[PDB]
Amino acid sequence: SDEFDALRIKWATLLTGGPALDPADSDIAARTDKLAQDANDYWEDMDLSSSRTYIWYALRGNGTSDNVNAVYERLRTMALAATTVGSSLYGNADLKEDILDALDWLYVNSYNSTRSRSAYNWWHWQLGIPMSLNDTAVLLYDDISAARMATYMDTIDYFTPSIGLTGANRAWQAIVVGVRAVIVKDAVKLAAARNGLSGTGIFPYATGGDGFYADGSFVQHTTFAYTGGYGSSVLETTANLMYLLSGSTWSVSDPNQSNVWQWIYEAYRPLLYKGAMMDMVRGREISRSYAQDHAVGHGIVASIVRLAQFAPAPHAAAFKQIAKRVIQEDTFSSFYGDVSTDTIRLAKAIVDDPSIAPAAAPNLYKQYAAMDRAVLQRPGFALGLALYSTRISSYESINSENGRGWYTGAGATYLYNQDLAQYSEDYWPTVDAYRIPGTTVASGTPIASGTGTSSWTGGVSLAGQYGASGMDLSYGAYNLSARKSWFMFDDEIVALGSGISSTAGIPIETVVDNRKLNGAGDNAWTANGAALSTGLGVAQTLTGVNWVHLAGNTADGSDIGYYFPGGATLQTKREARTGTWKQINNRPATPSTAVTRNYETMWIDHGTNPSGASYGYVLLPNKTSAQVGAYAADPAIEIVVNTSGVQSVKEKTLGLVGANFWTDTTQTADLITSNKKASVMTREIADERLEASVSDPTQANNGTIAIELARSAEGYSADPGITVTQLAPTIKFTVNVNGAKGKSFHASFQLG
Numbered sequence: 001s002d003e004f005d006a007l008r009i010k011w012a013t014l015l016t017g018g019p020a021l022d023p024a025d026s027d028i029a030a031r032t033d034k035l036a037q038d039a040n041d042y043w044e045d046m047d048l049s050s051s052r053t054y055i056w057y058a059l060r061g062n063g064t065s066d067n068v069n070a071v072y073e074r075l076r077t078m079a080l081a082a083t084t085v086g087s088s089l090y091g092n093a094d095l096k097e098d099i100l101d102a103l104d105w106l107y108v109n110s111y112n113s114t115r116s117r118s119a120y121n122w123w124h125w126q127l128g129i130p131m132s133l134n135d136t137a138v139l140l141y142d143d144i145s146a147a148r149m150a151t152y153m154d155t156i157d158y159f160t161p162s163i164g165l166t167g168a169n170r171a172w173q174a175i176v177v178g179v180r181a182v183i184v185k186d187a188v189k190l191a192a193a194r195n196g197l198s199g200t201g202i203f204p205y206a207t208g209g210d211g212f213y214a215d216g217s218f219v220q221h222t223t224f225a226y227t228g229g230y231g232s233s234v235l236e237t238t239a240n241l242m243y244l245l246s247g248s249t250w251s252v253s254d255p256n257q258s259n260v261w262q263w264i265y266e267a268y269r270p271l272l273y274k275g276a277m278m279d280m281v282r283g284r285e286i287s288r289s290y291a292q293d294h295a296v297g298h299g300i301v302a303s304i305v306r307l308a309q310f311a312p313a314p315h316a317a318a319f320k321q322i323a324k325r326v327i328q329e330d331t332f333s334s335f336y337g338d339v340s341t342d343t344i345r346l347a348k349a350i351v352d353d354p355s356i357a358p359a360a361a362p363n364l365y366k367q368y369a370a371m372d373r374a375v376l377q378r379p380g381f382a383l384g385l386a387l388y389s390t391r392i393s394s395y396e397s398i399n400s401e402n403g404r405g406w407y408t409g410a411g412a413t414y415l416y417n418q419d420l421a422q423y424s425e426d427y428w429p430t431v432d433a434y435r436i437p438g439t440t441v442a443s444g445t446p447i448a449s450g451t452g453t454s455s456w457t458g459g460v461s462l463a464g465q466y467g468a469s470g471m472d473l474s475y476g477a478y479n480l481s482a483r484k485s486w487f488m489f490d491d492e493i494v495a496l497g498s499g500i501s502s503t504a505g506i507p508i509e510t511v512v513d514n515r516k517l518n519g520a521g522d523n524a525w526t527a528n529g530a531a532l533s534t535g536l537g538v539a540q541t542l543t544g545v546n547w548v549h550l551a552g553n554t555a556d557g558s559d560i561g562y563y564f565p566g567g568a569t570l571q572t573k574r575e576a577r578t579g580t581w582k583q584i585n586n587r588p589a590t591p592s593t594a595v596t597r598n599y600e601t602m603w604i605d606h607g608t609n610p611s612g613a614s615y616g617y618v619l620l621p622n623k624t625s626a627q628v629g630a631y632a633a634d635p636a637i638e639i640v641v642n643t644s645g646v647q648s649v650k651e652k653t654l655g656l657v658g659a660n661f662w663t664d665t666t667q668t669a670d671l672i673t674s675n676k677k678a679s680v681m682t683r684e685i686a687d688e689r690l691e692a693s694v695s696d697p698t699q700a701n702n703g704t705i706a707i708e709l710a711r712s713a714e715g716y717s718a719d720p721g722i723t724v725t726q727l728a729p730t731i732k733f734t735v736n737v738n739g740a741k742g743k744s745f746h747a748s749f750q751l752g
């Protein structure tokens with residue numbers, strides 16, 4: 001025996017859960033039954049014929065990478081069901097044989113050195129197929145001969161012999177060369193795998209392009225926020241490879257691995273909400289039925305559990321605490337339901353360890369300036385804001401996936417509450433893709449995939465407690481411009497719109513919300529204190545409404561209230577919509593079965609060719625209609641200004657004032673005066689202290705932002721980069737935003 005053999009067994013238990021597995025456990029058993037069932041289901045359907053032209057009727061066609069990739073996964077599944085303890089097919093030599101025969105069959109008939117390394121969908125030829133193959137190689141390792149185990153590892157080397165791509169792709173190459181390295185007992189390769197993690201898009205932060213950023217953002221394909229998509233994969237593979245290499249002579253030594261710990265804290269933690277990974281950062285993957293938000297979220301948490309096995313002292317315990325809290329929070333879909341058996345083993349030991357307490361829930365506001373995203377986490381709810389600009393594209397759609405992601409990241413709001421299934425249970429293929437909440441669009445017309453023309457997209461963060469965001473809207477697909485802002489406070493989110501103009505000749509509308517209702521679609525809702533009809537298929541206009549209340553799909557924790565300051569007229573309809581995942585993901589393996597969900601859609605109608613139109617609403621999560629009515633009577637909010645040049649909102653009770661300035665001219669909102677495009681927020685504690693945060697959301701100003709506050713101060717402390725030039729009679733200071741990359745600069749003044 002040698003090291004390589006140790007590593008291989010370590011990976012074998014990663015896939016199986018080792019001989020340790022306790023089939024008595026209800027969840028270990030549940031997973032096992034399915035593996036065996038599915039495995040059995042395939043096997044007893046394979047064409048075992050000597051002269052077969054295919055291994056599975058359904059997957060025939062040696063030329064389509066999609067099919068070939070799937071025949072390998074199936075095999076991998078049977079390998080596991082044949083290798084994991086407790087399985088109805090454990091040890092079954094017959095099964096192992098057939099699997100092996102299937103592999104040989106593909107070496108000559110479909111997967112070998114003949115095919116182009118660049119054939120259609122290299123991902124399958126260079127990463128997908130090989131990852132599965134390795135896993136099989138490791139499991140049936142003993143039952144495999146040298147001649148046989150060569151036709152496997154040689155072909156794999158042919159397709160992926162090096163490491164040299166970006167983030168997710170680079171990491172995948174690394175796990176492919178790394179695993180085939182421990183089976184072929186090669187060290188040169190194995191070290192090239194460990195070293196790969198130090199490459200672009202992984203360990204080292206990125207200042208542009210793919211990879212993780214110091215502000216917690218993650219980018220893939222150069223212009224798309226992908227934390228929950230390709231990012232999800234990166235976390236998983238990197239963690240899996242780092243764990244395999246931990247404690248070996250090929251252990252990771254790069255100092256930047258420390259960054260991996262921060263990924264969890266700043267990159268993933270803020271984007272998880274009770275088991276779900278927010279879709280706004282999942283890209284084109286929101287169109288995949290097998291990968292909805294909680295399923296995807298479980299995988300992220302599994303990578304955390306894995307990470308907690310070798311993580312240094314401080315971090316390991318923190319990880320255990322975070323995972324424990326998430327396993328417990330998710331009452332929608334059981335975590336143990338869709339993760340590997342070894343994952344269930346390791347987690348169960350954390351959840352049952354009484355000494356490990358659940359980490360606290362996050363309570364903050366974070367601006368991911370590098371990917372045009374912003375999050376708000378409050379005890380009762382969370383808000384996801386998806387923006388785009390000259391730096392980040394509207395949405396991604398390649399390989400006929402996500403054909404309706406048009407406005408998924410165009411100022412879209414995502415509200416998370418007790419209704420944990422809002423975005424799961426086939427939301428995407430049934431929701432009206434032309435009406436994504438928070439957005440302003442030309443009714444029923446789409447926009448293309450690509451970056452925008454305005455640089456003003458970002459926001460400011462006041463000590464990570466509160467914030468404000470903005471997006472200068474201007475579509476290329478058709479004439480339409482507007483100024484959209486959002487102000488996140490303690491229990492309400494204010495949305496303002498102005499400069500709404502168009503010549504498209506198409507009715508422009510702003511969608512307040514589009515909520516999926518319960519199975520009956522009978523959620524109770526009220527407007528101005530009057531119950532409204534709850535029948536499906538009914539469309540109605542609400543004139544002069546000051547507030548609306550919609551009951552959630554759960555007894556408590558999912559109600560939503562809407563406040564319209566100067567009164568508004570809403571176009572609404574409640575209906576049952578039908579669709580298929582096939583419609584937003586036209587690939588062979590995607591389900592065509594029709595599904596039906598209920599929605600309550602509400603929007604403001606700006607008319608056709610409007611000029612200077614505007615809107616203003618406040619979202620009030622978890623409040624009863626009686627409260628929403630109360631709020632509307634004596635609101636803690638007060639619109640300071642909603643013009644084309646500046647949008648400002650004040651929070652009477654918190655002493656908060658937010659203001660986004662859209663032009664490089666001198667303008668003033670309440671006590672704030674600015675001379676440049678900027679996002680500002682201040683907090684005033686009567687005769688005590690005054691705080692202020694500023695940011696250049698354009699990330700293009702290479703000079704300064706001259707700010708002036710209408711208050712007299714006695715002293716101050718400011719982040720470096722802020723030069724205060726006058727404390728009395730009024731506060732004056734400048735902010736050096738050259739290369740600030742959208743960050744927020746803070747400063748606190750003591751009043752007299």
Ligand SMILES: C[C@]1(C(=O)O)OC[C@H]2O[C@H](O)[C@@H](O)[C@@H](O)[C@@H]2O1
Pocket residue numbers: 123128
């Ligand atoms: C196996 C599958 C799939 O999801 O079907 O095939 C294609 C792959 O390439 C994409 O770039 C990734 O998003 C990855 O997640 C995909 O995995």
Ligand SMILES: [Ca+2]
Pocket residue numbers: 489490491492636651653
């Ligand atoms: Ca409030």
